Design a protein around this ligand. Structure first.
Ligand SMILES: Nc1nc2c(ncn2[C@@H]2O[C@H](COP(=O)(O)OP(=O)(O)OP(=O)(O)O)[C@@H](O)[C@H]2O)c(=O)[nH]1
Ligand SMILES: [Mg+2]
Lengths: 351, 427
């Protein structure tokens, strides 16, 4: 009922980090699973008692309010969800809006944690969503480049560049100069991520020789250079087309295996459809049915489903490989409108 | 003397550039002293057999690898015609360049090696005799001459049986594409020796047809649509000392004169023609078929790129917010659904475009609806679909300006489908 996914978490995290308060009046609360909620309740109550010691009225009220709204959202639960609970509550000073967020995280919380601060304390949740497996991608041609980024199954273009290398006003560039330009631009985008430990690798891609010269030269900052994938990937196109081409072909980089799995599953899903094999189960009933039988070899779930976590859970036990179809994937919306965003591929027939 | 655009196409290494180069030579368009120097440079780099090809292939990477990478344009003149001849690459990485070439062409020479294995490879599932033939059809090339090449090669040695074998295979395939195969010359040549290029070859007595030059004269010039609004897809943009920034491209429709004010879409930048040049000859007007460079006052090279389209200000080229098309699916490893995003190759442009809906599946031969909103399409299907380009794209309705209204769909470096645009919603 409460459990969110990692995608849903990352989105929320983006809002929560905007919240601020002039004093230590934002409530952050983490309850590990299996804590009698009547014990958390006793603690919030002791906290409430202490509030009258806060001399500044507008501070003391903001804290009483947040504790009450928390004790309210809690009063409604019988026990904690499997991964525990986190609550963020208080009023944002710049906007004026007061909210009490409550949810269960994708992964379980291991300590009880209570804090009032000028901001929500989200560190544990930031650590939970950054997988530290980002791959930088640079596609180089003699006169074109594309810089993109891969995390998980999410592929994106960060920057496209076209130079002035030839095939009043006069403009003209040597290949060497466009490469330096490309390098600097890639560095500004990628070197920051490399420092946060987010970026684990850089793929260099493109058609023919230009990519080899770009690597051999002194264009790319040494920190990017240290995490270069060994194999250059030949691709013909720029932009997202080019990025997809490069990711699919980079078989020796493990951080890309997730995107490949997402793309290949959707392709196997479509194959089955086109060949009229009838080895595809959909609908919650039949999916649940097939799952209970251990029939499902691969489950495909649209990231926007609310019960996403329920099914992710069910699959791991049932014997099914999971594939979360992200909204960025080409087939995403069709898979949501036409199959409700939930379908499995059978390893054996039911009927 | 009427002008025509010729694209040279075919599988990698089959002999495209050697043919064009050698043809220009025995037609005396190339200085013997230059051919001498090229040959010496070719031998000294370990590539003797590239002396004619190196007339066309000039880039450092082309010479290093021994392949063509992008288009080269050369003027030569036969008894009846003046041709702009366009040398296109065979390498699979650069079929996007070959396609811009086809989009500018009136006719095609398909160069096909008769050498053992080279032919079969080109005509294989993923071969570029196959692919280039397909793309030439879709970009609207009807007139075709085929040069069955390398007859001189030891594993061929002017054998009529080998020749008739390649002709028949080529015929069965070409007829399935909709070509009028009975009308098209299959000339046995040797791009390297010269056989049947301009004069008749003693080595092949059994051959009675045209030589390649004769075949050229037998072509027919196309309609000149001067009364439709000006459209010039830009193939490249140079920045030239004296001229400034000069877009190059073939005038598809309309007419262009020095002095004209012109707009480039989709950017929306406007300039004014200082000058016009075709094959180093300055012009005052340019009409459909003219392959030209036009200097533009007030426009920066950074404002405009390949695939942009130039028209007059009163009737500017249409920018598609979205567009509708009839498509046939040549090849796909699974299925195509709403949301599918191949790159669209139209005129000189190539822009990814998302299928936002599949209105109807059609019977590929009759055109009747066989299913409203199909769940998907697969290889062999025809359909009416809606397209939203990922970035601003210029297209016209096929019924209005067909040369901006026919397209290929490509994905993972393969040709997936072909199309004609049946409607455009303007930006
Ligand atoms: N024996 C023989 N060899 C030929 C003939 N024509 C071309 N070749 C050889 O085939 C090789 C390829 O020649 P190219 O002219 O570069 O072929 P191409 O189709 O233009 O090359 P791409 O654009 O890269 O596909 C060269 O080594 C030529 O010498 C021919 O008529 N006979
Ligand atoms: Mg060539």
């Amino acid at each position: 009922r409460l459990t969110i996914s990692k995608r849903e978490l990352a989105r929320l995290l983006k809002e929560l980090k905007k919240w601020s308060a002039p004093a230590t009046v934002l409530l952050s609360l983490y309850i590990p699973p299996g804590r009698p909620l009547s014990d958390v309740m006793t603690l919030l109550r002791q906290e409430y008692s202490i509030t009258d010691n806060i001399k500044l009225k507008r501070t003391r009220q903001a804290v009483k309010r947040a504790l009450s709204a928390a004790m309210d959202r809690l009063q409604m639960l019988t026990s904690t969800p499997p991964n525990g609970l986190v609550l963020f509550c208080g009023e944002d000073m710049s906007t004026g809006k007061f909210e009490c967020f409550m949810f269960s995280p994708p992964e379980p919380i291991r300590v009880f944690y209570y804090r009032t601060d000028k901001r929500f304390i989200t560190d544990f949740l930031e650590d939970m969503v950054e997988d530290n497996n980002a791959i930088g991608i640079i596609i180089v041609e003699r006169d074109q480049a594309t810089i993109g980024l891969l995390k998980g199954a999410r592929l994106e273009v960060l920057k496209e560049l076209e130079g002035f290398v030839p095939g009043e006003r006069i403009i003209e560039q040597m290949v060497d100069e466009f490469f330096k330009k490309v390098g600097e631009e890639a560095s500004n985008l990628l070197v920051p991520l490399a420092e946060k430990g987010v970026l684990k690798g850089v793929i260099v891609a493109g058609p023919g020789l230009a990519k080899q010269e770009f690597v051999e030269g002194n264009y790319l900052d040494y920190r990017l250079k240290k995490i270069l994938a060994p194999e250059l990937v030949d691709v013909a196109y720029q932009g997202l087309q080019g990025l997809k081409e490069a990711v699919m072909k980079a078989e020796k980089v493990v951080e890309a295996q997730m995107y490949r799995d997402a793309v290949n599953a959707m392709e196997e899903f479509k194959l089955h459809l086109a060949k009229g094999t009838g080895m595809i189960v959909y609908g919650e009933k039949d999916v649940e049915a097939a799952l209970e039988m251990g029939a499902v070899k691969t489950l495909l779930i649209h990231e926007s489903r609310e019960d996403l976590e329920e099914w992710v859970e069910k699959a791991k036990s049932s014997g099914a490989q999971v594939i979360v179809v992200p909204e960025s994937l080409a087939e995403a919306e069709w898979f949501l409108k036409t199959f409700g965003g939930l379908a499995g591929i059978l390893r054996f027939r039911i009927s | 003397k009427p002008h025509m655009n010729l694209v040279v196409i075919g599988h990698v290494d089959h002999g495209k550039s050697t043919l064009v180069g050698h043809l220009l030579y025995r037609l005396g368009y190339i200085e013997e002293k230059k051919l001498k120097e090229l040959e010496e440079q070719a031998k000294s780099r370990g590539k003797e057999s590239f002396k004619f090809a190196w007339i066309l292939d000039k880039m450092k990477e082309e010479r290093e690898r021994g392949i063509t990478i992008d288009l080269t344009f050369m003027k030569f003149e036969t008894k009846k015609y003046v041709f702009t001849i366009i040398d296109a690459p065979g390498h699979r990485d650069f079929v996007k360049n070959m396609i811009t070439g086809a989009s500018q062409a009136d006719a095609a020479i398909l160069v096909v090696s008769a050498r053992k294995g080279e032919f079969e490879a080109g005509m294989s599932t993923e071969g570029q005799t196959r692919e280039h033939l397909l793309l030439a059809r879709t970009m609207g090339i009807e007139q075709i001459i085929v040069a069955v090449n390398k007859m001189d090669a030891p594993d061929v040695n002017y054998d009529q049986k080998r020749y008739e074998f390649v002709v028949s295979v080529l015929k069965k395939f070409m007829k399935g594409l909709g070509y009028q195969v009975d009308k098209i010359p299959f000339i046995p040549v040797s791009a390297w020796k010269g056989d049947n290029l301009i004069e008749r070859s003693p080595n092949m007595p059994w051959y009675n047809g045209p030589t390649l030059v004769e075949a050229l004269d037998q072509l027919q010039p196309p309609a000149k649509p001067v009364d439709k609004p000006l459209r010039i897809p830009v193939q490249n943009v140079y920045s030239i000392p004296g001229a400034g920034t000069v877009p190059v491209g073939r005038v598809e429709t309309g007419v262009l004169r020095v002095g004209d004010k012109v707009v480039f879409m989709p950017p929306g930048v406007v300039g004014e023609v200082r000058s016009i040049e075709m094959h180093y000859q300055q012009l005052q007007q340019a009409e459909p078929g003219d392959n030209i460079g036009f200097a533009v006052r007030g426009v920066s090279k950074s404002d405009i790129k390949r695939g942009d389209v130039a028209g007059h200000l009163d009737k500017p080229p249409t920018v598609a917010e979205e567009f509708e098309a009839r498509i046939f699916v040549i090849w796909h490893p699974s299925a195509i659904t709403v949301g599918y995003t191949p790159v669209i190759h139209v005129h000189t442009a190539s822009v990814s475009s998302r299928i936002i809906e599949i209105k109807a599946k059609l019977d590929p031969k009759t055109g009747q609806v066989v299913e409203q909103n199909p769940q998907f399409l697969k290889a062999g299907d025809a359909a009416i679909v809606r397209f939203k380009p990922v970035k601003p794209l210029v297209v016209e309705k096929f019924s209005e300006i067909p040369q901006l209204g026919r397209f290929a769909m490509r994905d993972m470096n393969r040709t997936v489908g072909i199309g004609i645009v049946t409607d455009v919603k303007p930006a």
